[PDB]
Design a protein around this nucleic acid. Sequence first.
RNA 1: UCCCAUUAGCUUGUUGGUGAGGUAACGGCUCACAAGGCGACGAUGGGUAGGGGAACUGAGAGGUUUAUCCCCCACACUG
RNA 2: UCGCGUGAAGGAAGACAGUCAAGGAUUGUAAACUUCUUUUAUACGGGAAUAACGGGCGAACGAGUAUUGCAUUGAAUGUACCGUAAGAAACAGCAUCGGCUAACUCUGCCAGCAGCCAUACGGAGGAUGCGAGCGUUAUCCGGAUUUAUUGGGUUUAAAGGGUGCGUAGGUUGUUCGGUAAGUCAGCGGUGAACCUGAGCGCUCAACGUUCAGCCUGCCGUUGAAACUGC
RNA 3: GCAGUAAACGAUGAUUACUAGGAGUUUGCCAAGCUUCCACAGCGAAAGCGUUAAGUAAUCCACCUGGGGAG
RNA 4: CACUAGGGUAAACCCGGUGACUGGGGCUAAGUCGUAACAAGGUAGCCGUACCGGAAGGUGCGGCUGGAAA
Lengths: 118, 167, 131, 122, 200
Amino acid sequence: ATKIRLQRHGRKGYAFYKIVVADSRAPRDGKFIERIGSYNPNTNPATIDLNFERALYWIGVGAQPTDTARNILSREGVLMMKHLLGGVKKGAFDQAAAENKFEAWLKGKKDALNNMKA
Amino acid sequence: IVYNRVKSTNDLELKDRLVAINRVTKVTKGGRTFTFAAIVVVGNEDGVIGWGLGKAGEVPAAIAKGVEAAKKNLIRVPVHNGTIPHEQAASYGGASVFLKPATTGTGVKAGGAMRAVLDSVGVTDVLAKSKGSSNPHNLVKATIQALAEMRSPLMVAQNRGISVEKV
Amino acid sequence: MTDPIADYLTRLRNAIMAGHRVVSVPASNIKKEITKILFDKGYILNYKFEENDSQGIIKVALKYDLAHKVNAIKKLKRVSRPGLRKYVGYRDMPRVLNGLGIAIVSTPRGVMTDKEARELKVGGEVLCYVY
Amino acid sequence: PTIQQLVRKGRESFADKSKSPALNSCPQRRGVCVRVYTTTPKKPNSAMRKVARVRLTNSKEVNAYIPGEGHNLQEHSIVLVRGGRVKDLPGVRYHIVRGTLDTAGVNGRTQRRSKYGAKRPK
Amino acid sequence: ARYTGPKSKIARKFGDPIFGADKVLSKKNYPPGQHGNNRRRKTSEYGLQLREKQKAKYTYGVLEKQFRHLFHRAQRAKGVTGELLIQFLEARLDNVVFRLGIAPTRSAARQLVSHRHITVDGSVVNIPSYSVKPGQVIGVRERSKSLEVIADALTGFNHSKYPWMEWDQSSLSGKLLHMPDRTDIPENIKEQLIVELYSK
RNA sequence: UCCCAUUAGCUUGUUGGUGAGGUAACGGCUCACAAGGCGACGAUGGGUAGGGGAACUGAGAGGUUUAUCCCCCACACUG
RNA sequence: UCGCGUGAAGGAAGACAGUCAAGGAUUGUAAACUUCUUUUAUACGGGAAUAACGGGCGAACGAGUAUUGCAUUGAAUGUACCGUAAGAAACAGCAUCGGCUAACUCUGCCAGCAGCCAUACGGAGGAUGCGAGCGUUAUCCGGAUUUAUUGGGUUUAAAGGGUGCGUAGGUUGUUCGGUAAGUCAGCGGUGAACCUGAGCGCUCAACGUUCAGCCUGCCGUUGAAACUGC
RNA sequence: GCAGUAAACGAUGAUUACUAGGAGUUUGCCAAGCUUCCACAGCGAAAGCGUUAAGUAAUCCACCUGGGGAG
RNA sequence: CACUAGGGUAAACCCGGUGACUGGGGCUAAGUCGUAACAAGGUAGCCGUACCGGAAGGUGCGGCUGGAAA
Ligand SMILES: [K+]
Ligand SMILES: [K+]
Ligand SMILES: [Mg+2]
Ligand SMILES: [Mg+2]
Ligand SMILES: [Mg+2]
Ligand SMILES: [Mg+2]
Ligand SMILES: [Mg+2]
Ligand SMILES: [Mg+2]
Ligand SMILES: [Mg+2]
C-alpha cells in the first residue's frame, strides 16, 4: 500500500531522513511518489520539517505511516479528528501552544584555575 | 590609414620589449656567414606602439638597431582604459589573430608575441587567439594591424554623422 | 539572380571599395526598406527612388568623411542566405560590433533594426549586418 | 562543401590507434622470453642494446628492451612488459619492468632507483 | 606536512628575512650551496614568478595544494585576485595569532594552535589553516594564560599597533576589525606574478 | 534513437474487408473475399550495443563513458 | 579526496663530507629552556533512541498526555590527569625548452625533442619540484580549426569529374490579394540526486543539508503577417 | 563493331551580378560580341591573378584530410 | 490426431583454420651489375598505350611544358 516513511540520506555516522510518500514495494532510498518533509535526529531538539497540508491529504486518502513517521506526524499535530467532528465546527485545538513547550535547558560552565606561579 | 606619430621626445616612456632572436645563415665560397635578427616592440603603455627589426652580427647591436627602428616607426591605437572598444580579427601572411574585449578583472589571456604587443600598447583586459602560424614577424604585425583597425564609439559616431547609437 | 539582397549589399560594397559616389540598384520593396534603414542610421548620404517602366531604380549617394577620406560603412555582411535561412527571437537578437553596428532584421511588425526589434520584443529573419 | 552537400553526406571522423597495441589497453602484461639477444642501433648511434623476444599472455610477439646495467634474463623467463619505445631502435616499442617477477633490480644503483627496481640501500 | 627544515637557508635565498629578524642574514646574503654568491645567472621571468610563489609559501607555511586552493578561492571571490589571495593568506589562524603577538614567529603561532592553546569565540580551535572572519575573537585559552613563552612574547608587545586588530590584555584576547588592504599588509610579495603564473 | 548500398528490392496472414472465436482489453491475436503494403525521406539483410539522468571534459558548440548513485528494460545452467 | 603531524624559541661558524687558505652543507649538529597536536598508560564518558508495552483522560472510537525497558558500532566522539622531543620523510629532476652545479668514472649507457658517449652515462657533494607521497605505463579529453553549422580547403602543397544532356533533389525576377506550413509573440502544463549564488552543521575542509537563482527542451492553446512556403 | 584511357591542362566545374587603367587584334555598326599581353584596388605563402580574376558576393554539383603499403 | 523443443539426414550458404608448392610488399645493412633521373645529367623530361629486354629501362604513335638553346 501507499506509505509514509523515511529514506536515509545523510552520510556515515550522520543520518538525515527524507520524509516521502512511497509505494511499499519501492526500494528504501529509491522511487517515491512525493516528498513531504525532512527529519534530522542528530540535533537534540530533533529537527523536523513537514508539509502540513500534503501530509494531511495523504493521511486522508489512506497512506499508512511507519512508526517513526507516525510519531513525527503526531508531534507536528497532523494526527487529529478536529476535521472528523460531525457535530461541532471551528474547534480550534490550539494545542500548538502547549506543544511549543520550549525546553531551554542548558548546562552550567566551570573553569580550571591556572596556578602556574613558576 | 595608420595614425602615425613623430619621434616621441616628450613621450619618452617607451619601454622596449624583445620578441624573438634568430641566428640566420648566409653561404659563401669561404664558408657560412652568421647574423642575428631581433624583433623589438616599443611602447609607452598607451596607444603609441612601434615595432622594428634589427639585424647585426651581435645580439646587443641587433637589439639596439631594433629599438631604433621601432622608435622611428610609431603609430597610435585607440585604446580606452585597459580594454579594446570591440572585437577584431586580422591576418598578415600566415598568421591570423582575433581579439575580443573581456571583463575588467580578467587580465591578458595571451602569450608570446601577442602578449608582448598588448603589454607595449597598454591593454590589460582582452581575450586573444592565434589561428595561424606562430611566426613572430607575422604575429606581431597582425596584432598591430588588428589594433589599428579598431574604432572607439566616438569615432564611430563621428564618421556615421550621428551622436548616440544607443551605446 | 539568386539573392537580390546579397546583390544589393555587393553593389554597395563594390562601389565603396572603388570609391564611387553614387550607386544604382534595381528596386524592390525590401531593398527600399533597407535603404531607408541605412539612411535613418546614417550610413548613406542620400537616396532616391525612380519609377521607370521597369521595376524601378534605387539611386544611393554614399557618405564619405572628408576629414579622413573614409566611407561611413566598413563591413556589409549577408546573414540569412537562400541556402541557409536564419531566424532568431528577440531574446537572442545579435549584437553587431559590440553594439556599435546594426543588424537589419525583418519582423512581423516590419523591417527594422535589432535595437527596435529588442525594444518591441519581436523576432524574425536576420537580413544583414552593417558596420 | 555546401550545406546541402553536408546534409546529404556529412563529415567523417577517424579514431586514433594505440601507440602500444599489444598491451590491449592493459597498463602492463605478463610474458615469457623466447630469445634474449643483442642488437645494433641506427646510423648515428653505436652500442649493443639488450632486447628480448617476449610471448605475452594474449599470444602476441613483442620486442622488449631491457634497461639498466646488466640483466639476469634468459629463455623461458617470466617478465612484465610495459609500454615505451626507443628512438634509435626500430621495431622495439616495449620495455621490461625491472624488479618484478623473474627480472631483478639493477645492482649498484643509487639514483633513479625506482625506475630500475632497486631497493633503498641500508 | 610541514617544511620543518633550516630557515636561514630560505632567508638567504630570498634576501628578505621572512622568518623575522636573525643575526645570520648579515655577512651572508647568498643562496645556499657551493654555487652561491657566484654572480647571478640570468633567471627567466618564469623563474622569477616561481621564486615569488615560493617566497609566499615559505612565508605563510602553506604547501602547494593548499596554496592552489587558496588561489582558486580568490579567483572565485569578488575583488582583485592578488589582493584577495594575500588577504586569505593573512586571515589564517596562525597568522592572526602571530599578528596579535601571542607568539614570536608564525611557526610558533602554528605550534600553539596545534597544541590547543588558542580559542576562537570561546571554543578551542586547533586547525592552523582556519580562516578567521572579521568580528571573531581569538584569545589565549584560560588553562594556558600563564605560559612562560606566551608571557615573554607579549612582553614588549605593548604596541599592538596593527589597525585591523584590537588587542585586549585584560582578557588576553583580540578581535579583527576588517580585511586590510594589500598596501596595509607589510609583505613584499608581488601577488601579480603569482596570479599570472597560476592563471597562464 | 549506431555503422555497412564491397547489402536494392522485401512481403503471402503479407495489406485491407466480412464474420466468428479468443483476451483484462482493441487488433491478422487466431481461423474461414480483394490484391494490397513497405521501399534512396534507405525497405530487407549483415555487424555492433542494454537505454537514460548523472559523471568527466571543453569558453561554447560538442565529445567520452553509463564503475559507484537513481529510473526503465532484459535475465536467473541452455531450450 | 580533505585535514593534521613528524616539534617551538635561543645557540658559532665543532667533527666528518664536498670544492678550493677560505667558500658550502650550517644555526645545520652538539648544549640549555618551554609545549604535548599526535603515539603510550589511567579515568569520566555522551549523541546516534523514539516510540514501545503496560497506567490515564474528553468521550465511545480515534487521538492527546505521563512512565519502564531498548546501542552492533563502544574504552568510538569528546573530556581530564601522569611524563615524555620523546615513537613518525621519502620520491623525482638539475645541458635548452625548465625551476635548479661543480668534482671523480667511463664501450657501458641515456633518451619527450634538439640529441649526448661529457654543465646529458654511473657514483659523490650540493641545489631544485613536490611531499605521506613521488615517479613510470595504460586510457580519455583540450589546445588540434587534424572533418572546420558555429569554424578549413582544391593553378603550383592533398584536392575540379574528359565533356555535355538530363532524372530525383537543392535554389527561385517583380507586383497585388488570400492562407498560415516554416517564422515571431503571449498564456498554461511538464521537465530524485548532481551542478550556480546565499546560508546552516561537520573544531576547519572534503562533505552533508536547506533555500533562492536554471530550467535555455517537449506538449497544449490564443494572437501577428515583414520574410520563406502554398 | 568493341574498348573508354591521356600532362583528356588554363594542372583553374557550371550559372548570375558588380569593380581601374594602358597596348594590340577579328567581326556587323563610337560601340558591342570575342580573342591575346602589362597592370589599380583587392586576393595570395610566394611565384603570381587582376573585367576571359585566383577580386567582391549568391545557388548547385565534384573532390581533399601526413607519406609508403596502394590504386 | 494436430502443435512443438530436441534428435537424425542430406544439401547449399556464411564464418574460421591448416596445406606440398608458389608470389608480391616493408624494414636493415651493404655483397654483385650497371648508370635510369637531378645541369641541354651528356639521346630534354613527363602522360597515355603497345611491343621487347639481366635490371634500372629502350623503341613506335599521339599529347603536355611541369624544357634548355634559340
Ligand atoms: K521570391
Ligand atoms: K590535348
Ligand atoms: Mg595530504
Ligand atoms: Mg597536387
Ligand atoms: Mg576540366
Ligand atoms: Mg586529373
Ligand atoms: Mg644518365
Ligand atoms: Mg637523359
Ligand atoms: Mg628494339
